């Protein structure tokens with residue numbers, strides 16, 4: 001199919017493997033710009049001009065897993081490990097709510113210390129503030145997920161990483177794609193708004209793999225989808241591999257919006273790390289969420305999944321104001337409510 005024909009099929013919602021493969025394979029500037037415009041327009045029509053702010057607190061960099069891409073992997077001895085106290089986390093969340101955050105995201109390595117009861121206690125305290133709570137804590141027993149839902153958690157982010165089971169197992173040697181999917185299905189069954197997503201440009205990953213990621217996301221109809229480029233970290237086995245391509249990653253975000261028009265899709269910090277102004281571009285190519293860093297010093301600089309974190313030198317309270325300025329200069333509006341998914345049922 002020609003570029004024009006692929007665009008027409010996307011507009012008619014003929015989302016075949018063949019159409020998706022061709023969209024990711026064509027490198028023509030004209031085609032790409034038309035794809036981005038289509039995603040931007042679909043975003044505006046379905047989810048409007050509000051950009052939802054999710055304040056993220058990265059509360060522990062301790063991890064029991066050994067994912068090959070991740071700077072927090074357990075084999076990395078070149079890292080000072082930290083744990084925020086429950087009181088520090090709650091009060092940091094309170095400060096974010098004081099600054100206008102309507103969702104608090106708690107993210108960590110897979111750190112056994114907190115699990116499950118300390119998390120439950122923290123979630124309960126933050127829910128009293130009248131905001132949404134999102135957890136992003138990795139893979140845990142169903143019972144832990146159940147306890148956290150009962151404690152009042154609203155959403156769970158668990159990127160599927162890669163839908164190729166062979167590549168998944170190689171990159172995530174403690175676990176499997178089967179496990180990851182089972183966790184995502186459990187989260188959905190328990191009533192969480194559930195987020196998946198993937199990295200683009202992983203070593204060994206192919207275009208067909210990216211197509212499979214898109215089809216996987218469409219199959220399971222996730223509420224949120226987080227996508228970013230792979231960025232090699234020097235203290236990992238993938239230190240010498242190539243970074244993911246920004247434009248290809250942007251096309252994945254655009255296609256995700258086209259496939260899942262009413263989903264919540266962040267402009268991830270990795271997009272802003274690989275290219276100056278990358279988040280702002282992504283917000284104009286299908287994304288409608290932004291996640292300003294709210295991890296305080298001295299811990300922020302110790303939570304580097306990949307190097308070059310854009311907020312690392314900024315003050316503790318800088319990032320919420322910074323994204324509000326961003327939203328205004330983009331001609332957009334901040335979210336007025338918790339920014340939960342607003343499903344538009346269609347055919």
Ligand SMILES: C[C@H](CCC(=O)NCCC[N+](C)(C)CCCS(=O)(=O)[O-])[C@H]1CC[C@H]2[C@@H]3[C@H](O)C[C@@H]4C[C@H](O)CC[C@]4(C)[C@H]3C[C@H](O)[C@]12C
Nearest residue numbers: 094095096097098099100101102317320321322324325334
């Ligand atoms: C935290 C401190 C002290 C007072 C306090 O503890 N304030 C709680 C407010 C709680 N809310 C955010 C829910 C109010 C919503 C009111 S609103 O009318 O916006 O719906 C207050 C005093 C002045 C406030 C800033 C300025 O204003 C400018 C700006 C407005 C944006 O918008 C949000 C960001 C920002 C930077 C503000 C953040 C924060 O807030 C500040 C620092």
Ligand SMILES: C[C@H]1O[C@@H](n2cnc3c(N)ncnc32)[C@H](O)[C@@H]1O
Nearest residue numbers: 069070159199229230231270305306
């Ligand atoms: C929180 C999310 O961050 C992503 N993540 C972890 N390590 C890297 C890296 N080196 N490069 C880019 N993204 C990464 C994973 O996709 C994880 O799910």
Ligand code: MET
Nearest residue numbers: 108109110136137138158
């Ligand atoms: C810090 S990585 C993101 C949170 C969790 N460890 C996961 O891998 O899903």
Ligand code: SF4
Nearest residue numbers: 063065067070073109
């Ligand atoms: S990606 Fe999440 S589980 Fe894997 S090593 Fe990093 S922090 Fe641990």
Ligand SMILES: [Cl-]
Nearest residue numbers: 054103134155
């Ligand atoms: Cl969220």
Ligand SMILES: [Cl-]
Nearest residue numbers: 226227266268
């Ligand atoms: Cl995300």
Ligand SMILES: [Cl-]
Nearest residue numbers: 228268269270
């Ligand atoms: Cl990211």
